[PDB]
Design a protein around this ligand. Sequence first.
Ligand code: RTL
Lengths: 46, 46, 46, 46, 46
Amino acid sequence: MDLAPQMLRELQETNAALQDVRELLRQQVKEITFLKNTVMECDACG
Amino acid sequence: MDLAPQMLRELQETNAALQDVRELLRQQVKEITFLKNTVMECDACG
Amino acid sequence: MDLAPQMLRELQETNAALQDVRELLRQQVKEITFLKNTVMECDACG
Amino acid sequence: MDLAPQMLRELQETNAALQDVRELLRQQVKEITFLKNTVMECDACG
Amino acid sequence: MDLAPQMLRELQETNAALQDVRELLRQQVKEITFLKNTVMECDACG
Ligand SMILES: CC1=C(/C=C/C(C)=C/C=C/C(C)=C/CO)C(C)(C)CCC1
């Protein structure tokens, strides 16, 4: 019945949030790759 | 007549959980960004 | 009527999954915050 | 009304994908904790 | 009924984003696995 319009707003907010997890992950991937790079060039390690 | 309310509830339950997942990531990012800086300043490497 | 009970089962499983993912992240953040503190006190970096 | 069969598909796919993300997080923490244990007994930091 | 279709757009969208999150993670894990193997191969630790 009248519950359908909100089901939409919930599926609307489940995408707004996921969109944010989508970019914060792609950021963390870059930061990690970078973290990896600094270690590859670590004289202390050899 | 239908299971619409039980459905509406699960949806909003997916959101509240996504709320926590979104926050844990934001925090985890400040941590990996901090970590990354320490090894760039680490005397032992370069 | 046919798939409605099935659209509820899946939703409930979406949260069960997201429930473990939610508690899985909590542990990852802490391990990562421990690794940071550890690296910080590292007597070779500073 | 018709649209339930197609909506069910998208949900089963949602749980198949999430099904993978769950295990990925279980392995990511697995090695994060090994990375921890590694820097702790690391004779450079002590 | 009236909005049934609009709910299908959102679901399909969460699927797409899930694939993105998914493939981002299999990469982040691929990287963290390297960082682990590398710190283990660090001569500074011994
Ligand atoms: C994609 C998505 C799901 C959420 C997945 C998340 C929130 C994955 C988070 C993974 C984390 C970020 C990994 C951190 O290393 C939900 C269940 C809402 C259903 C449909 C959309």
